[PDB]
Amino acid sequence: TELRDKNRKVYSLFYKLDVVQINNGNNSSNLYRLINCNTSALTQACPKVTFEPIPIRYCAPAGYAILKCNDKEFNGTGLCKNVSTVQCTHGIRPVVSTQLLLNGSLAEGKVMIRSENITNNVKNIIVQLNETVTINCTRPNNNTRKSVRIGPGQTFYATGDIIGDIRQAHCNVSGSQWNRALHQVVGQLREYWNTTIIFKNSSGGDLEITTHSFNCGGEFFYCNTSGLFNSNWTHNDTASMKPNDTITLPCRIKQIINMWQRVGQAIYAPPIQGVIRCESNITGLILTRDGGGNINESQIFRPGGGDMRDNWRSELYKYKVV
Amino acid sequence: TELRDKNRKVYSLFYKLDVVQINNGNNSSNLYRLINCNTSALTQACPKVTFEPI
């Protein structure tokens, strides 16, 4: 309580991902501890502060400029002549996401592709499409908030008893425009070939890389990137376009995260009361080539979202400080 | 412990200069107090930082 002597035991709703079992009484009403508390600290997420991305424009000072290459075929690094000098960059919406880019400027004219070293499979293959598609990860059922005062002015926003049937949050993708964008990409993916490719899923590792993690009103939505690799545009693209897939798929939710692998004073995402619906465009991708693949037979690509910086330089390849 | 209510007794090695026997009782009797705690607070010296000259 706000009083030092008075305490109170009160109940709320929590997730299984947010805690881990201890005191391994293998199964009799086992206790749990927060995953981040045992390793690091924790604080409130300041719910009045939002978490959505606004278009940010990075302006240069006097004595400097921003040279832009308006050529649509211009790749990441190289020479360019169609110059445009600017003082502030285009408004970039820093969508904090992994293995995917959302609400970004499209590489019109042709799907743009980049990579550090094409011979090295470990390097990230950046992609930037030329047509958007609506990806909707959604929690329809409402949330609840309860302000429990912990101290003299300190209060925690716990998740109260939810009203109605608590249906699981899930996610949706439209397969028609997605398969069209895949047709465009696999038309673009021919570096030296005409028809051979394989698409598999991630190899496993960190939870953020294993799925498509992003933000939705503070709630860290880890929506599953499993409906991506279920396609074979090997020989006939029309053969892969004929199976439409109105992909209804699972999407998990999390409250806490270590931003940029900062295992410190983490933040608990607060209640978001009302229906949650993250519908977003698609602008590009960050894939990776498998090491266990032949040289010329077939290159296996799979989503990779390790380096967050790759998600931000997708549109900065046009601009450069000069 | 890491949790609020959970506590535990653990042992270590310490010097005599760090503390002083609490003279409120008869003798020490395994009862000591930090010399600097009663005057002010105390925090660690960030052991990853050393104190060598440059």
């Epitope: 005191n23 009799s28 | 959970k6 506590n7 535990r8 007794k9």
Partner: antibody, heavy 137, light 111 residues
Framework: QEQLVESGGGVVQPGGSLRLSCLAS????????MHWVRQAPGKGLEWVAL????????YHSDSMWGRVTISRDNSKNTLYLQFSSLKVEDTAMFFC??????????????????????????????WGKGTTVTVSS | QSALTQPASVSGSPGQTITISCNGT?????????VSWYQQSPGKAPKVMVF???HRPSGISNRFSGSKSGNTASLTISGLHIEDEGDYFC??????????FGGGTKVTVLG
């Protein structure tokens, strides 16, 4: 749940020995100082032996002192009692009871031992199955 | 070595209050207040009914209470239930950290 099972007890004769093994499950037995108790025919409970969490010290009733030796095995999560110079008066069902939970409580605050040990010196909260021993000449 | 002495058996009506009282010594009862009371039903292992005499262990209702007077302990039970039947044994921790059990009292509901 936290379960204890005694075994090894059986019909024996005085002057020999016996090995009573008390297995445990459902908790971290590595620091639970157990209690060996006996109940004779037509008699009440009678404490036999007690061992600390680390096996450093141990306590035996002056009647049963010397005849029995208690030991622990944290790897097996087991307790053991080795008898010697058995007497006909030792006819009883032997039980293997736990100690007063893991920590010791005071003012709602719980204290564990050194290296986070599950120590106490209090009532026995949990009791085991129990095994019979019949010493007869 | 000498078990804590109490009557061999007592009985009481359904719902009638009663109070067992067992004797001891100052080395165990009067020297340290860690006096407990166990219960054993016919066909059941022992189970604790009192420890920390002015407080009770798990699975014990407010009907059961404990008190101590010098070298003696007492177990009061108001509102005798059907589960109260069985042999009660008071025990105390000695100054040598050893435990000692009581003689026993077979409580049974009248009827």
């Amino acid at each position: 749940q936290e379960q204890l099972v005694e075994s090894g007890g059986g019909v024996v004769q005085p002057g020999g020995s016996l090995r009573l093994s008390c297995l445990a499950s459902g908790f971290t037995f590595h620091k639970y100082g157990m209690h060996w108790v006996r109940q004779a025919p037509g008699k009440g409970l009678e404490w036999v032996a007690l061992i600390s969490d680390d096996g450093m010290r141990k306590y035996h009733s002056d009647s049963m002192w010397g005849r029995v030796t208690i030991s622990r095995d944290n790897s097996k999560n087991t307790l053991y009692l080795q008898f010697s110079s058995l007497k006909v008066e030792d006819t009883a069902m032997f039980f293997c009871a736990r100690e007063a939970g893991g920590p010791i409580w005071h003012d709602d605050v719980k204290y564990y031992d050194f290296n986070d040990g599950y120590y106490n010196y209090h009532y026995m909260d949990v009791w085991g199955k129990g095994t019979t021993v019949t010493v007869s000449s | 070595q000498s078990a804590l002495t109490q009557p061999a058996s007592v009985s009481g009506s359904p719902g009638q209050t009663i109070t067992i009282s067992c004797n001891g010594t100052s080395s165990d009862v009067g020297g340290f207040d860690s006096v407990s009371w166990y219960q054993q039903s016919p066909g059941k292992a022992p189970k604790v009914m009192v420890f920390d005499v002015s407080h009770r262990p798990s699975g014990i209702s407010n009907r059961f209470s404990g008190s101590k007077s010098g070298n003696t302990a007492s177990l009061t039970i108001s509102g005798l239930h059907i589960e109260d039947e069985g042999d009660y044994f008071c025990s105390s921790l000695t100054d040598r950290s050893h435990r000692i059990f009581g003689g026993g009292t077979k409580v049974t509901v009248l009827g």
